[PDB]
């Protein structure tokens, strides 16, 4: 692809003698590296950088006004994936973003898997009903996939989504558009993400990725004396997930575990904090926290569950309350803080 440019024949001959293949190859190196390779001088090396940089992109001017006004041209800035409940959508101001990793962390029995299943079901609805008209990919890491609960949810779906007409519901093939994968190791998870997910995403069979418990293998394979390889693996995984989500305009939902706090990270008066440290926290866009209070349900009788927004570039820190029943996860009206 280096011959599409306009260079002097001597420069092209020199760069061909240096076994340089593409524009990414030449932009990968530095000025002194190209000086040592091509045996050129600074002005023509600078001109080569000029030409390559202009080749990658240029001549296009984008302003915030265009992003704000041209909604159809930029679906990332204006389109959100619904959660299946009006109250949760109101808490999230529309739903999940279409570009970036969204975390969901909490203690056991908080209700993360139920939310994952509900999102996997709701991603298949038409555009006007909050969906993306596509399937989903589910990756299991700790336990086996709960198929019985999925069958119950698919059966009960017409009774949860009241707004959608029944005729459109009848033609929806819920079970045929969900793909299930199983992973037993860190290397297996990395290989799966690198190979199987892009194939499914490119063909258009799915527009949502659920890594589920991402902390499960890292908690068991890396100790406190091997933080550097763990950080390297986490950075690679996060970079790959972000690249895939940006390329295919599909949300990525990750489920995380918590550890006892036992506050540089802003977790002073909290009992538990998300695991995997700050290296994993640096890769996220929206951070949520689902919690259950067992000391208050002992008085109420019914479980007390809250969903909280820890951090977001466009959402204030707030919370609401929800319940879990046979239909699925549903929010409680008039509880947002």
């Amino acid at each position: 692809d280096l011959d599409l440019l306009d260079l002097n024949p001597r420069i092209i001959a020199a760069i061909k003698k240096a076994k340089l293949k593409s524009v990414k190859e030449v932009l990968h190196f530095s000025g002194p590296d190209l000086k040592r390779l091509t045996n050129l001088s600074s002005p023509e090396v600078w001109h080569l950088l000029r030409t390559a940089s202009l080749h990658l992109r240029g001549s296009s001017i984008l302003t915030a006004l265009q992003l704000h006004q041209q909604k159809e041209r930029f679906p990332t800035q204006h389109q959100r994936l619904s959660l299946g409940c009006p109250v949760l959508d109101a808490l999230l101001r529309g739903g999940l973003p279409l570009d970036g990793i969204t975390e969901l962390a909490g203690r056991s029995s908080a209700g993360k898997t139920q939310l994952a299943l509900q999102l996997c079901l709701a991603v298949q609805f038409p555009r006007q009903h909050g969906g993306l008209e596509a399937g989903a990919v589910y990756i299991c890491t700790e336990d086996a996939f709960p198929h019985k609960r999925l069958q119950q949810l698919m059966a009960q779906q017409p009774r949860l989504r009241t707004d959608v007409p029944g005729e459109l519901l009848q033609k929806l093939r819920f079970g045929s558009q969900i793909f299930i994968e199983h992973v037993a190791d860190v290397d297996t998870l990395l290989e799966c993400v690198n190979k199987k997910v892009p194939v499914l995403l490119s063909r258009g069979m799915a527009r949502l990725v659920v890594i589920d418990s991402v902390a499960a293998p890292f908690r068991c394979e890396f100790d406190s004396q091997a933080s550097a390889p763990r950080a390297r693996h986490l950075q690679s995984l996060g970079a790959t997930l972000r690249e895939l989500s940006s390329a295919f305009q599909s949300p990525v939902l990750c489920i995380n575990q918590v550890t006892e706090a036992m506050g540089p990270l802003g977790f002073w008066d909290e009992r538990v904090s998300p695991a995997l440290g700050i290296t994993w926290a640096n890769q996220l866009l929206v951070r949520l926290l689902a919690d259950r209070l067992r000391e208050e349900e002992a008085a109420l009788g019914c479980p007390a569950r809250t969903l909280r927004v820890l951090s977001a570039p466009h959402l204030p820190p707030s919370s609401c309350s929800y319940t879990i029943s046979a239909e699925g996860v549903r929010g409680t009206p008039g509880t947002q803080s």
């Binding site: 530095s30 000025g31 002194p32 590296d33 933080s227 506050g263 540089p264 990270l265 802003g266 002073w268 440290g277 700050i278 290296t279 640096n282 204030p316």
Partner: protein, 98 residues
Amino acid sequence: LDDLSLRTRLLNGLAQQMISLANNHRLAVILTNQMTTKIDRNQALLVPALGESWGHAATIRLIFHWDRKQRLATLYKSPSQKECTVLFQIKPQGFRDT
């Protein structure tokens, strides 16, 4: 990026280009960095990433952190003023004080 020498060379070149641009076009250049953990004497402290030689690149360095529940801004380095610490908060209207 496993070759750290290449990373340092690229970072130094970028810093030189940015300072040259700022001086030549009468601009203000703003860069945002991340924080990492330094493990010493069985104690963990948060330090800016990308190594020690990156500390010389910028002219002014600001550090944001939580103390208990408030947000603090510290003028870590500056060639014209003195080290201090102030309080700020984020409102629905944006970056504010108090």
